[PDB]
Subunit: 231 residues, 3 copies
Amino acid sequence: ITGRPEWIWLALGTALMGLGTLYFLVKGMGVSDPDAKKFYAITTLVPAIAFTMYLSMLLGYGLTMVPFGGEQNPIYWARYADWLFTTPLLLLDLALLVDADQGTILALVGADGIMIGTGLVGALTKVYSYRFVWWAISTAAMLYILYVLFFGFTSKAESMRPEVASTFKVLRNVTVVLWSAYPVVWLIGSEGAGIVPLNIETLLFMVLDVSAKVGFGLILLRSRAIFGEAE
Amino acid sequence: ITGRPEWIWLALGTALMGLGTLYFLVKGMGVSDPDAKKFYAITTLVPAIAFTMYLSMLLGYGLTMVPFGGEQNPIYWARYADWLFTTPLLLLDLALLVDADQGTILALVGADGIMIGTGLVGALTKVYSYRFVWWAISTAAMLYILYVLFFGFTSKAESMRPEVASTFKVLRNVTVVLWSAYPVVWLIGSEGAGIVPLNIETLLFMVLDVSAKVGFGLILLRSRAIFGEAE
Amino acid sequence: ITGRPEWIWLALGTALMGLGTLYFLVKGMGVSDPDAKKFYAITTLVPAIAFTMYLSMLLGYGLTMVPFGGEQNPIYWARYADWLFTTPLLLLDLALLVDADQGTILALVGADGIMIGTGLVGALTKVYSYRFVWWAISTAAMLYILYVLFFGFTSKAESMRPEVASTFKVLRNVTVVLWSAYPVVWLIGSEGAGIVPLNIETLLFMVLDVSAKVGFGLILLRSRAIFGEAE
Ligand SMILES: CC(C)CCC[C@@H](C)CCC[C@@H](C)CCC[C@@H](C)CCOC[C@@H](CO)OCC[C@H](C)CCC[C@H](C)CCC[C@H](C)CCCC(C)C
Ligand SMILES: CC(C)CCC[C@@H](C)CCC[C@@H](C)CCC[C@@H](C)CCOC[C@@H](CO)OCC[C@H](C)CCC[C@H](C)CCC[C@H](C)CCCC(C)C
Ligand SMILES: CC(C)CCC[C@@H](C)CCC[C@@H](C)CCC[C@@H](C)CCOC[C@@H](CO)OCC[C@H](C)CCC[C@H](C)CCC[C@H](C)CCCC(C)C
Ligand SMILES: *C/C=C(C)/C=C/C=C(C)/C=C/C1=C(C)CCCC1(C)C
Ligand SMILES: *C/C=C(C)/C=C/C=C(C)/C=C/C1=C(C)CCCC1(C)C
Ligand SMILES: *C/C=C(C)/C=C/C=C(C)/C=C/C1=C(C)CCCC1(C)C
Ligand SMILES: CCCCCCCCCCCCCCC
Ligand SMILES: CCCCCCCCCCCCCCC
Ligand SMILES: CCCCCCCCCCCCCCC
Ligand SMILES: CCCCCCCCCCCCCC
Ligand SMILES: CCCCCCCCCCCCCC
Ligand SMILES: CCCCCCCCCCCCCC
Ligand SMILES: CCCCCCCCCCCCC
Ligand SMILES: CCCCCCCCCCCCC
Ligand SMILES: CCCCCCCCCCCCC
Ligand SMILES: CCCCCCCCCCC
Ligand SMILES: CCCCCCCCCCC
Ligand SMILES: CCCCCCCCCCC
Ligand SMILES: CCCCCCCCCCC
Ligand SMILES: CCCCCCCCCC
Ligand SMILES: CCCCCCCCCC
Ligand SMILES: CCCCCCCCCC
Ligand SMILES: CCCCCCCCC
Ligand SMILES: CCCCCCCCC
Ligand SMILES: CCCCCCCCC
Ligand SMILES: CCCCCCCC
Ligand SMILES: CCCCCCCC
Ligand SMILES: CCCCCCCC
Ligand SMILES: CCCCCCCC
Ligand SMILES: CCCCCCCC
Ligand SMILES: CCCCCCCC
Ligand SMILES: CCCCCCCC
Ligand SMILES: CCCCCCCC
Ligand SMILES: CCCCCCCC
């Protein structure tokens, strides 16, 4: 395990996701409100899935070698397995907060699936120049998602409770900033142009992942917006 | 890319799915009705997914070699990845049109999953005679789906709005004819008996795919059946 | 096929799932009640999926070799493909019976996904001692599911119809006993410590699978709890 310099960040990531999972699990024990239960379920599952995939990367299972540029390049494929399930759960948290219509939710989840799926294909593609074609398609799917979060959701939040409108606005802003960093790190890291070494890349993704999951969850689950308006 | 004679049909397929995706995306921009949004979301996602998988076939990612009959046989596995997601979306379009009950929808999607999954296993099976066992099981799942579309849905459409009944009937008929061709092409093509060469097989699937997705979508999204009855 | 001593149990399993599938399919033909249709759909799909995966194991497709302990160890990976889809369907049968809230259903299905997914990783892991780390995480996800079935569902059933409360209690008890045997068989069988040989392991899983699917389904589909209260 320690044979890879990036192991320290995989281990820290595993620990922080594990701790985040346990914290949300305990916190949600005292919850009976049916609406709050939905948000706790979604939000606890996110770091639990990430915990398993960080562990698989730490132990070496979630790593494969991909030939491109005349080299055997270490590619952590387990990231995409994580993201396939956790990024639509994160979007679902946002969509339920603002009572999004079903068509909009399906558009978001579908675009998200395309985003992660094409990122996976790009990560595993052996023809170097083609990796960036997949990156571009994935990034276009991301831009669609960000567009919807701003010009379909923000003006939906404003007709809702003030506490859900303010909580949505904060989580929207956190999401757009954090999620936009992922394609940049991929592009300059070992999957793309290879300018930033894998150990630093792994650190960067770990900070983004913990912030986008445990950070996000801490903000959401401390808000009164997750509860039905009750006396 | 041009090293494979079937590349021209993969390229045309990619282009037509891409163009179809953009057309539906633009067309649905001016839509606020919650019901119509569902149909636009579902129907736009279908060629978008197909676009990505056609591209993966064009670039060579979605192709593998399978030993059977003492030969290395080129198998485009990306078709099944496409179909796994797009065929239940197509069925969902039909089921929502007639306000199908939840049990019926689950039966359809489940049978569809079995249909595509067993087709994939058959496509990748190395014992030649066993490929046709999987083809038979998949075809039985197809026949179940077609049965339900006729003797569970058609008489559901007739108690609904005339515009939804007439639109459903047309899309049902398009679906049954087009979908029934797929097992025949598989059986006589490079996956099955090998009587029709891969380049012609690829052409045939491209015509079926564009018709079943973009053709289907053009009929559906031009109907007033996708809108709630409103003043 | 007969080259593997466990083939007889794979063949019997295939037959019993096939027969169970046909029986439930015929039985549900005379059903119009929308609630009952849901239970028939879910419950018929379960042995149908299991039939396909038992067949893939019989024909040899669903088997791979995994190096650990200095040996090539036969691992039937198709079990996890089965279980990935059938165990959440089984939980859905239980959850719908007691009209579980959406948050609880998502927690169950999510924990179940983690349970099966980590079992799959453990089954395919090449470092022997690490296989048991994945077994432990999977078992913890199982224990969560069993906890919810007892201390979240049982007291939900009691405020419902007596026929649904009594049917739920029986199916809950069947589920907890049968499902708890699976991690034990894995641990002592060819995936784990290797004390029980593969042919006996295969027998054990076949008895558990038929009981947990066809047995379970026979109890559920003969109950009046699956019908809406109607005059
Ligand atoms: C509604 C939304 C969910 C829409 C989803 C959007 C989605 C369509 C976007 C594209 C997804 C698609 C790229 C998934 C591809 C998975 C694939 C990378 C798995 C690895 O297999 C690739 C090659 C080795 O590189 O296998 C070597 C050759 C092997 C023989 C491969 C044969 C097995 C195939 C992988 C079977 C395909 C199954 C499905 C792709 C399962 C989807 C997995 C998940 C990653 C989407
Ligand atoms: C409700 C509905 C959805 C019901 C669904 C119906 C469904 C049950 C029908 C059968 C689906 C099942 C056949 C999927 C099999 C996928 C498999 C072909 C992927 C390729 O792996 C096959 C061999 C190489 O040929 O791998 C070589 C050996 C490797 C070590 C394989 C180990 C990895 C396994 C593939 C893990 C299994 C994961 C699940 C099958 C994911 C499902 C993928 C999708 C195609 C259904
Ligand atoms: C809401 C709930 C559903 C939550 C779900 C919980 C879930 C997160 C729990 C963990 C699931 C995760 C372990 C699935 C891993 C599948 C993996 C074993 C498939 C086989 O690939 C493993 C190695 C060979 O051993 O591939 C060799 C290297 C290859 C290059 C691998 C590259 C292809 C990757 C497999 C692509 C990943 C796609 C997704 C994992 C699809 C999920 C399949 C299913 C088994 C969950
Ligand atoms: C918890 C993990 C999260 C929130 C991950 C988010 C990841 C993305 C938004 C990834 C986006 C990518 C692209 C837009 C193109 C390049 C490849 C990706 C997959 C890194
Ligand atoms: C957009 C793509 C569509 C509508 C594809 C439909 C495909 C089928 C109905 C495929 C059916 C098959 C069988 C019935 C058995 C042989 C294998 C298949 C998968 C080709
Ligand atoms: C129809 C099949 C059923 C009901 C299978 C149930 C399987 C399980 C509950 C498996 C549990 C496992 C663990 C808890 C850890 C070890 C690995 C598994 C996957 C066997
Ligand atoms: C969105 C953030 C992307 C920028 C990442 C900056 C990383 C700077 C680290 C120094 C680069 C290491 C190069 C020498 C090894
Ligand atoms: C459902 C349509 C299946 C029939 C396809 C007919 C294809 C005819 C093309 C000629 C066959 C090529 C054989 C000589 C290369
Ligand atoms: C939950 C049941 C697990 C116990 C399984 C008992 C199997 C006993 C069979 C005898 C073991 C075979 C060892 C000699 C080959
Ligand atoms: C490819 C995996 C996509 C599914 C991820 C799980 C999250 C799905 C959330 C469903 C949202 C509800 C839509 C109506
Ligand atoms: C194996 C992939 C199956 C899922 C495909 C996505 C479409 C699912 C549509 C869900 C229909 C709603 C059922 C209640
Ligand atoms: C990884 C596969 C998980 C999906 C299995 C299919 C069963 C899903 C049942 C959905 C229950 C409804 C939740 C709201
Ligand atoms: C186009 C929608 C406006 C809100 C999205 C902001 C786009 C940020 C760009 C992210 C950088 C990705 C490379
Ligand atoms: C049995 C249901 C009647 C409607 C379905 C028509 C079946 C068409 C056969 C398709 C050919 C597949 C090989
Ligand atoms: C902790 C919840 C109480 C009900 C679950 C009973 C646990 C049975 C243990 C199963 C054995 C697995 C190794
Ligand atoms: C070796 C790099 C070749 C450049 C490929 C860039 C493709 C980016 C596509 C953006 C439309
Ligand atoms: C393919 C990228 C699309 C980003 C711009 C959004 C187009 C308008 C969509 C309106 C729902
Ligand atoms: C080499 C071909 C052997 C014939 C197999 C046909 C099987 C079809 C099954 C239909 C019930
Ligand atoms: C070779 C076996 C080494 C023992 C591993 C047991 C790990 C079990 C983890 C339970 C917390
Ligand atoms: C509760 C702490 C969980 C941390 C387990 C994984 C950390 C890796 C240590 C090497
Ligand atoms: C908008 C046109 C999209 C076409 C891109 C793929 C066509 C392949 C050209 C070689
Ligand atoms: C209807 C009987 C189904 C049995 C088919 C599979 C049994 C395997 C026989 C070798
Ligand atoms: C993006 C950083 C999130 C910070 C989380 C802090 C949570 C405290 C309530
Ligand atoms: C099956 C062929 C479909 C033809 C689509 C034409 C759409 C015009 C409205
Ligand atoms: C766990 C054993 C189940 C027994 C099923 C018998 C069904 C008869 C109604
Ligand atoms: C990591 C366990 C958290 C302890 C409880 C925190 C207050 C709910
Ligand atoms: C008003 C919300 C500001 C949140 C910005 C957080 C940036 C990481
Ligand atoms: C809305 C601001 C987006 C900031 C992008 C930051 C990418 C590192
Ligand atoms: C391909 C872009 C379509 C242009 C608009 C067509 C009329 C909505
Ligand atoms: C009355 C509907 C006829 C549609 C037939 C289309 C055949 C491709
Ligand atoms: C309902 C008519 C079906 C026609 C099947 C055509 C197969 C090529
Ligand atoms: C296996 C076929 C079952 C025959 C009908 C049983 C009574 C519904
Ligand atoms: C009162 C229900 C008892 C069911 C026990 C079944 C054990 C297999
Ligand atoms: C509730 C009793 C569980 C029995 C476990 C049996 C495991 C073989």
